[PDB]
């Protein structure tokens with residue numbers, strides 16, 4: 548997260564760190580006791596390593612009593628998650644066991660009604676992604692409040708010409724933005740999961756290149772279809 552602030556410890560208990568052999572790869576969001584929603588492109592770096600999900604974390608490295616590591620039993624990328632195509636970048640991860648919920652580990656309800664979030668709505672994006680353009684990694688969870696941008700402006704020639712479909716949403720990226728290591732994390736509007744971070748053009752903090760987020764409401768039937776196969 549660029550231009551954000553350290554989150555209050557365990558105030559975003561739905562946050563998941565998606566890890567490969569214990570290294571933070573992407574964010575994730577707990578959506579059920581045994582399911583984590585993230586971004587399909589995250590498993591490009593995976594190949595043949597233990598994909599795990601860290602729950603109850605504020606810090607990635609500091610010993611916290613609420614920290615729990617789960618193995619992934621199943622990785623369900625969206626069928627059309629063709630690499631480098633910004634569309635359909637959703638991934639469902641089934642945990643090895645049902646997570647015990649508490650003040651530091653709690654799922655986030657997601658929007659099911661297929662309705663666009665009103666532009667200008669303030670939404671919270673959180674992650675352990677880089678905090679500057681050089682690639683400095685924070686140890687503690689960071690967050691930022693970003694207003695939602697209307698789809699047309701985000702689609703626009705200056706922004707991302709022709710590529711922003713009905714299944715995507717955008718948020719302002721002027722100085723404050725999601726960045727490398729934040730994909731798969733949540734865009735939360737009024738406590739409701741509305742989007743999942745994606746990398747888009749991969750430029751961070753540029754006003755002309757808005758942050759792109761997979762519109763979770765567009766995938767309601769797909770999410771429901773996977774969450775029943777458990």
Ligand SMILES: NCc1cccc(-c2cccc(C(=O)Nc3ccccc3CC(=O)O)c2)c1
Nearest residue numbers: 588589725726727728729730745746749750758
């Ligand atoms: N709002 C702009 C924005 C938002 C989120 C991420 C980026 C961004 C920038 C530069 C490089 C990358 C990258 O290599 N990603 C990657 C590739 C493969 C596997 C995992 C990942 C981590 C990830 O995507 O977070 C991403 C940019």
